Amino acid sequence: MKIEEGKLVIWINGDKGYNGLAEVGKKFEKDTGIKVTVEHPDKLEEKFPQVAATGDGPDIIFWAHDRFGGYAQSGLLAEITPDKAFQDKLYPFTWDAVRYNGKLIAYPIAVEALSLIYNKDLLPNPPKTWEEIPALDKELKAKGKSALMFNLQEPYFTWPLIAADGGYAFKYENGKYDIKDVGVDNAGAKAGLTFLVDLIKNKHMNADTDYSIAEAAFNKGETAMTINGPWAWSNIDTSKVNYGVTVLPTFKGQPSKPFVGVLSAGINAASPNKELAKEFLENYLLTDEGLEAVNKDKPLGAVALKSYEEELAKDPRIAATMENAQKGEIMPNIPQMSAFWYAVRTAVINAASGRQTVDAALAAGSAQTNAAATGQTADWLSIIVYLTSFVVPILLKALYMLTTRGRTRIRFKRKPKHLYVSLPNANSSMKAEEITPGRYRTAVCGLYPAQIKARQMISPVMSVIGFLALAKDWSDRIEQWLIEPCKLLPDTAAVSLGGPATNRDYLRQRQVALGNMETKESKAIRQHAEAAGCSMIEDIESPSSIWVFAGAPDRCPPTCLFIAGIAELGAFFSILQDMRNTIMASKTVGSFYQSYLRRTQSMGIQLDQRIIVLFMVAWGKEAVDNFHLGDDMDPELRTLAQSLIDVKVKEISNQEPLKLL
Numbered sequence: 065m066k067i068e069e070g071k072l073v074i075w076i077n078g079d080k081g082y083n084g085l086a087e088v089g090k091k092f093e094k095d096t097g098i099k100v101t102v103e104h105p106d107k108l109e110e111k112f113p114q115v116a117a118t119g120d121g122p123d124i125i126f127w128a129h130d131r132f133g134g135y136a137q138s139g140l141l142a143e144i145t146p147d148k149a150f151q152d153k154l155y156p157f158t159w160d161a162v163r164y165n166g167k168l169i170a171y172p173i174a175v176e177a178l179s180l181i182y183n184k185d186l187l188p189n190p191p192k193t194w195e196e197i198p199a200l201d202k203e204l205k206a207k208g209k210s211a212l213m214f215n216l217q218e219p220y221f222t223w224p225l226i227a228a229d230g231g232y233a234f235k236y237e238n239g240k241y242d243i244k245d246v247g248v249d250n251a252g253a254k255a256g257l258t259f260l261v262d263l264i265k266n267k268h269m270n271a272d273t274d275y276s277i278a279e280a281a282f283n284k285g286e287t288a289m290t291i292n293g294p295w296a297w298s299n300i301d302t303s304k305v306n307y308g309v310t311v312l313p314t315f316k317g318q319p320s321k322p323f324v325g326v327l328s329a330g331i332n333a334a335s336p337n338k339e340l341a342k343e344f345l346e347n348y349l350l351t352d353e354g355l356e357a358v359n360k361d362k363p364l365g366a367v368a369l370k371s372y373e374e375e376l377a378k379d380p381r382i383a384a385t386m387e388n389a390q391k392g393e394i395m396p397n398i399p400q401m402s403a404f405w406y407a408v409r410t411a412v413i414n415a416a417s418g419r420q421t422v423d424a425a426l427a428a429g430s431a432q433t434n435a436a437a438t439g440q441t442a443d444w445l446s447i448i449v450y451l452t453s454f455v456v457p458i459l460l461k462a463l464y465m466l467t468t469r470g471r472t473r474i475r476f477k478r479k480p481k482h483l484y485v486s487l488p489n490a491n492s493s494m495k496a497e498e499i500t501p502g503r504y505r506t507a508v509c510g511l512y513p514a515q516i517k518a519r520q521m522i523s524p525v526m527s528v529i530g531f532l533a534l535a536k537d538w539s540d541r542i543e544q545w546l547i548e549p550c551k552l553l554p555d556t557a558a559v560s561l562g563g564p565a566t567n568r569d570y571l572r573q574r575q576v577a578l579g580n581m582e583t584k585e586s587k588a589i590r591q592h593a594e595a596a597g598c599s600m601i602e603d604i605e606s607p608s609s610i611w612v613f614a615g616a617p618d619r620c621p622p623t624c625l626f627i628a629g630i631a632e633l634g635a636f637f638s639i640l641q642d643m644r645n646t647i648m649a650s651k652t653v654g655s656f657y658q659s660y661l662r663r664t665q666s667m668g669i670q671l672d673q674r675i676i677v678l679f680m681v682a683w684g685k686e687a688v689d690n691f692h693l694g695d696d697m698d699p700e701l702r703t704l705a706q707s708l709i710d711v712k713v714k715e716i717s718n719q720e721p722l723k724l725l
C-alpha cells in the first residue's frame with residue numbers, strides 16, 4: 065500500500081500480466097518476509113513524475129523504455145549497478161534500449177512488437193499487402209463481418225503504417241538521434257496516413273474505435289483480422305478462437321515498420337527500498353521461474369533473459385513478432401518522445417475524423433514535435449529567485465566546485481536542503497528554468513560581485529589573462545580611462561568641466577540608449593535582487609564593477625546589462641582569451657569572443673564595439689604583458705623534489721627543510 069523502508073510498491077500497466085507478477089510477489093513474501101502489493105492505476109506514467117517527487121510514488125515502475133529517458137534527466141530514477149556477470153545473462157541490445165548517456169536507468173524484461181493477427185478459419189489466406197485489404201472487405205462485409213479493427217486512438221497501432229513509407233520520429237545517424245530532424249511531415253508520412261483515412265471514409269473502419277471493442281469484435285468472430293501485441297493473446301485463447309500471427313502487411317511494396325518496445329523496470333530514486341528492488345528483479349522476477357508466472361497470465365513476448373528465451377523461441381507466434389521487430393525500428397528513449405506521441409495522437413484523431421486535412425495534421429504535429437526539441441531561453445527572474453533563496457556562502461562555494469574538474473543533476477549541500485545544478489545532455493532540450501553550470505556562474509556573479517571581491521575569486525580562465533593586475537589598480541585605472549579624451553567621438557563640444565571630450569561622456573550617451581532599451585524584464589530582475597540583500601552595481605566606476613566578470617560567466621549577467629559600459633566590457637576579457645590561445649598555438653612549432661557576443665544578443669543588445677576598442681588601447685599591453693603563458697612544475701616533481709630534500713635536510717643538518725620556491 066505505502067512506501068516504507070520495508071514494504072514494496074510496484075506499478076505496472078493494466079494490459080500487462082499484473083496478476084502473474086503479483087504471484088511472484090507472494091513468493092518473495094514467502095522467502096524473505098517482504099510483502100509485495102501490485103497496483104495498475106490508469107495513466108500511471110503521467111501522474112508518476114507528480115508523485116515521484118512528493119514521497120508518494122511506487123518504489124518500482126514498469127513501462128516500455130521510451131518514457132525512462134525523460135525520467136532519468138529529471139533525476140527521478142536510481143542508478144543501476146548489476147554484476148558484470150549479470151549483464152551477460154541478458155542480450156546486450158536490450159541494455160542499449162535502457163542505456164542513456166552511458167548509464168543504466170532500468171532493468172529490461174521483454175521485447176514487444178505488434179504483429180498481424182488473423183482468424184485462420186475465416187481467412188486462411190491472409191493478405192500480403194495493405195492495398196489488397198479494400199477489395200477483400202467488400203466480400204466479407206457481404207457476410208456480416210469486417211476485415212480489420214484496431215485502436216486508432218493510440219498512435220502506436222497506426223505508426224507502423226505511417227512508418228511504412230518512410231516516416232520516422234527522429235533520424236538516427238552516426239550513433240545517435242538528431243532531435244531537430246523530424247520526419248512526421250515528409251512525403252512518406254503523408255502518403256501512408258492518407259491510405260488509412262480513406263479506409264474510414266469508405267466505411268471499412270470507424271474512427272470511433274478503441275482497444276476493448278476491437279479485441280471483443282475479433283474475439284466474437286466479427287472481424288477477420290486485428291493488429292495487437294503479445295499481451296492480447298491470453299484473452300483471445302479464452303474466447304475460443306483459432307488465430308494466426310504473421311508479418312504485418314506491406315504498403316507500397318515496403319515493409320510495415322512497427323516501433324519496438326522493450327518492457328523495462330525502473331527504480332524510484334526516492335525509494336527507501338533500492339537494495340530490495342534490485343534483489344527482487346534480478347533474483348525473483350527476472351528468472352525462468354519468475355517470468356513463466358507472468359507469461360502464464362498474459363504473454364510478455366520475447367524476454368530479455370537468454371536462459372528463458374531459448375524456451376520461448378519454440379512458439380511460432382513469437383518468431384513472427386521478432387520478424388516484425390527486425391523489419392521495424394527500436395523506439396528511442398529520448399525525453400522528446402512523449403512530445404512526439406502526444407503530437408501524433410492528436411494528428412491521427414484530427415485526421416481520422418476529418419476535422420482537418422492530413423497535410424495540416426502532420427504539419428501541426430511537426431511544429432509540436434520541435435516545440436520541445438527547440439532550445440528555450442532562460443527566465444532569469446525564476447533563476448535569480450531560486451538562487452537568492454539559498455544562503456550566500458553556499459552559492460559562492462559552488463562556483464569553486466564548478467572549476468575543480470568535477471567531471472545527471474549534480475547535488476550541492478535543524479533543517480536540511482539540497483541545491484541542484486543541472487548539466488545539459490546533448491539529447492535533452494533546454495528548459496526555460498534549467499540552470500546550466502554556465503548560467504549558474506552568470507546569475508551568481510551578477511548578484512554577488514562585492515562578495516566575490518572579498519574572497520578574491522579568480523577562475524583558471526580569468527587568472528591566466530592577468531585579471532588581478534587590472535583588479536587591484538581598478539579604481540585608479542578606471543578614472544584615468546574616464547578622464548581620458550575620447551577624441552574620435554562624440555563631436556567634442558559635450559562635457560560636464562574639461563575643454564576636451566571625455567570617455568565618460570560616451571558611457572553617458574550609451575546609458576541613455578540602454579535606459580531606453582531597458583526591458584521591464586530586466587528592471588524586474590534588478591529590484592528583486594536588492595530586496596534579497598543582493599546590493600548591486602550602478603556604474604563602471606564601482607568597487608565591484610569588474611568583479612562581475614571574475615567568475616567567468618558565459619553571458620553578461622542579467623543584473624548589469626543596461627549599466628554602461630559593462631555590456632561592452634565583457635568582450636574585452638573574452639577577446640583576451642582568444643588572444644592567448646592563438647599566441648600559444650603560435651609558440652608551438654606545429655571563439656570565446658564570438659560565443660560571448662552571440663549570447664548577449666540573445667538578451668537583446670547591440671554591443672557598441674567601439675567601446676571595446678577604447679578598452680583595448682588603454683589596457684591592451686598591460687593585460688597582454690601580464691599574461692601567464694609559461695607552464696609550471698608538475699605535482700610529481702614538486703612533491704618528489706621536496707621529499708628528497710627533506711631527507712637530506714633531515715640527515716645533514718637536522719633543521720627545518722624550507723620549501724622549493
Ligand SMILES: OC[C@H]1O[C@H](O[C@H]2[C@H](O)[C@@H](O)[C@@H](O[C@H]3[C@H](O)[C@@H](O)[C@@H](O[C@H]4[C@H](O)[C@@H](O)[C@@H](O)O[C@@H]4CO)O[C@@H]3CO)O[C@@H]2CO)[C@H](O)[C@@H](O)[C@@H]1O
Pocket residue numbers: 077079107108109110128129130131176218219220221325402405406409
Ligand atoms: O494524450 C492523452 C493520452 O496521454 C497518455 O498516453 C500517452 C503516454 O503518456 C505517452 O507515454 C505515449 O504513450 C506511448 C508509450 O510511451 C509507448 O510505450 C507505447 O505504449 C504502448 C506500450 O509500449 C505497449 O506495451 C502497450 O501497453 O500498448 C501501449 C500503447 O497503447 O505507445 C504509446 C503511444 O501510443 O503517448 C500516449 C498518448 O498517445 C495517457 O496514458 C492516455 O490515457 C491519454 O489518453
